[PDB]
Design a protein around this ligand. Structure first.
Ligand SMILES: CC(C)CN(C[C@@H](O)[C@H](Cc1ccccc1)NC(=O)O[C@H]1CO[C@H]2OCC[C@H]21)S(=O)(=O)c1ccc(N)cc1
Lengths: 99, 99
């Protein structure tokens, strides 16, 4: 689908049987989510953004279904004010910016 | 132009005679830049991100030239680690996400 930018690019995602809206963020290298449980072992990491840094739990090989499209990749879990889909996953769906 | 997301969507920008690379950020409501002087008065404001908050000087009706396209709108100046082009300006060029 084509998405304009007059409103926040929210999309519903299915991840670990959980339904959530997520922000298609081209400014995000990686995908981070609010607190929720996921499969496998994880590494603690710190990510930097506007205003400072936050500690998050790093998880690899996470299944997310995004607007009917399937993807697997790294998903970080931490105190983000919003769920964002970063570029690590936007690529796999062939998402592009266009103007 | 069509832009893939395997690398950061950086673009060269011209703003107040200054050349700058900026991040096309669909996760950014507004456009912010690192410290720089711009003409006229400004209002102090606070913006929120993943790491926390920062105070920035708000300027309205700012001319920015982006990859050959011209736009005018609000541009904030503050301690961002990167210059980002938020949705307040991404719309005016008719930028869209596509997958
Ligand atoms: C700091 C930059 C490199 C931009 N980043 C993504 C960006 O889209 C954030 C994503 C974002 C969105 C909402 C809240 C926090 C962070 N946008 C943002 O900070 O927006 C603020 C300026 O315009 C306003 O719009 C809303 C918040 C304000 S980031 O959050 O820090 C980031 C960096 C690395 C990763 N892996 C994931 C996210």
């Amino acid at each position: 689908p084509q998405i304009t930018l007059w409103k926040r690019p929210l999309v519903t995602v299915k991840i670990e049987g959980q339904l959530k809206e997520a922000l298609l963020d081209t400014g995000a290298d990686d995908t981070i989510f609010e607190e929720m449980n996921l499969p496998g072992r994880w590494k603690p990491i710190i990510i930097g953004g506007i205003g400072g840094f936050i500690k998050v739990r790093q998880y690899d090989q996470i299944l997310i279904e995004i607007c009917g499209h399937k993807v697997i990749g790294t998903v970080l879990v931490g105190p983000t004010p919003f769920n964002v889909i970063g570029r690590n996953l936007l690529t796999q769906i062939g998402c592009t910016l266009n103007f």
